[PDB]
């Protein structure tokens, strides 16, 4: 941390619902979705989750939706995926 090795010492927070919600809105953006989806709620569901774990939700909501026979994805899947990723966030 002595500068010249790391000159400008900067710390990356937070994150939180918002970071993820955006990160979610980023990851869910790629995937085809179902309108009426509120990602903040989904991220409000999100707790102890991270931006790569955000992908999990979109994968699980996609897992849901692809299992829903949906390249679209409803909102419910995500919040369901949240808890399911909040599983693995809390699991192991």
């Amino acid at each position: 941390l002595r500068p010249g090795r790391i000159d400008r010492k900067i710390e990356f927070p937070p994150p939180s619902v918002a970071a993820r919600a955006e990160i979610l809105r980023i990851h869910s953006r790629k995937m085809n979705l179902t309108r009426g989806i509120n990602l903040r709620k989904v991220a409000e569901k999100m707790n102890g989750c991270s931006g790569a774990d955000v992908k999990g939700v979109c994968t699980e909501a996609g897992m849901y939706a692809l299992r829903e026979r949906r390249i679209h994805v409803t909102q419910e899947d995500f919040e369901l995926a949240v808890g399911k990723v909040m599983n693995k966030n809390q699991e192991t």
């Binding site: 085809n32 979705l33 390249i71 679209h72």
Partner: protein
């Protein structure tokens, strides 16, 4: 817009029932009260005009008109003009405040869209476009471009119009190829499957129209049975035994709406009944389908006889392919119909030539023809190059 344009179409088609007339403008007569529909309901009351559309308080009131519901009042307009102006004035300074505050980008375009959609309700084919343009001018989202789709779709399909919209439909979908990600390709192919369904689709978007569903429909531009019905029939009347008996053989899609609308009862229903390889059963089912299907719906009517005789013909292919040797008598006689008249239009398929049918009037007997080495394969060969050769002549037609 949807029912509007159709209850337009319906009564503008009014032939069979006064209800075809009645039921249609019935709503409209209330729907012009619903929305200030006059400016086109204006020309819409000139639409079916000069047939039975001849009874109006503004345009024309005539006894040969069986529809008086093609009537107005200037109140409608006053109401409208009020509504309109109200709508107008509302958005005016609002949009102007959207301009004044520099308020929103799409939020500016928002009340524009509102401005526009009035014209949908209004039956104005004008500012909405310019509004949309100035919405699209404010469009930072392909979702606002999606709204262009909507708009242009609401534009054309409020009149069930044609090309520019389709062209726009291209143009609007051309911008980002996304297609509302999964979707607006739907709307695209939907409306496209309607655009091209003018009057055709025939093979073309019929599939596409069959393909995606129900992944959107529109309300004001369409219902879902709509595509289903439409998608079916053409794709049906067009596509393969296999395809149909792969697909319209049934779909949960179908299984859902089967007879749900009775708004079918026939389409592949009586056609798979035909595809059961009937003779007589389907022979009514046609017109049974037809007047229940074709006359009813915009393109379904407008195309008319494209349908009519091909499946008529078509089965004969089966009937042939069954028989090398088929007695047309055994056909036309033993099928309990006009031999000759059947045979006649059937004979009208000799020059349409899609008969391999080798067929008698006298002995009333049917035989086949076959591609063999000729096929079209070793057959078509002639022209194909020729046209090239022409272009090749054209090629050398350049020189200098």
């Amino acid at each position: 817009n949807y029912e509007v344009s159709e209850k337009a179409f319906l009564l503008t088609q009014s032939k069979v029932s006064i209800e075809q007339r009645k039921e249609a403008a019935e709503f409209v007569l209330a729907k012009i009260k619903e929305e200030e529909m006059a400016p086109y309901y204006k020309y819409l009351c000139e639409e079916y005009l000069v047939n039975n559309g001849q009874s109006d308080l503004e345009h024309d009131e005539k006894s040969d008109s069986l529809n008086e519901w093609i009537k107005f009042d200037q109140e409608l307009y006053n109401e409208l003009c009020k509504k309109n102006e109200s709508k107008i004035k509302e958005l005016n300074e609002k949009i102007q405040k959207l301009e004044e505050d520099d308020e929103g980008e799409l939020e500016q375009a928002q009340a524009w869209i509102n401005l526009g959609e009035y014209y949908a309700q209004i039956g104005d084919k004008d500012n909405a476009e310019k509004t949309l343009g100035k919405s699209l001018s404010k469009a930072i989202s392909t979702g606002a471009k999606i709204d262009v789709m909507l708009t242009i779709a609401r534009l054309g399909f409020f009149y069930n119009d044609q090309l520019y919209v389709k062209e726009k439909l291209e143009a609007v979908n051309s911008m980002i190829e996304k297609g509302g990600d999964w979707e607006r390709r739907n709307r695209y192919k939907t409306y496209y499957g309607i655009h091209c369904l003018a009057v055709r689709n025939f093979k073309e978007a019929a599939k596409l129209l069959v393909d995606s569903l129900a992944t959107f429909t529109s309300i004001e531009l369409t219902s879902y049975e709509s595509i289903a019905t439409y998608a079916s029939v053409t794709g049906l009347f067009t596509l393969e035994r296999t395809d149909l008996k792969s697909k319209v053989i049934d779909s949960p899609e179908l299984l859902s709406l089967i007879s749900t609308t009775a708004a079918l009862q026939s389409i592949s229903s009586l056609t798979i009944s035909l595809y059961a390889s009937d003779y007589a059963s389907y022979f009514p089912y046609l017109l049974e389908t037809y007047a229940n299907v074709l006359i009813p719906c915009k393109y379904l009517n407008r195309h008319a006889d494209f349908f009519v005789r091909e499946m008529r013909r078509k089965v004969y292919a089966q009937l042939l392919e069954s028989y090398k040797t088929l007695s047309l008598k055994s056909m036309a006689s033993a099928f309990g119909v006009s031999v000759a008249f059947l045979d006649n239009d059937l004979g009208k398929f000799i020059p349409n030539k899609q008969l391999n049918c080798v067929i008698d009037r006298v002995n009333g007997i049917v035989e086949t023809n076959r591609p063999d080495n000729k096929n079209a394969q070793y057959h078509l060969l002639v022209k194909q190059g020729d046209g090239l050769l022409t272009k090749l002549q054209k090629y050398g037609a350049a020189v200098r």
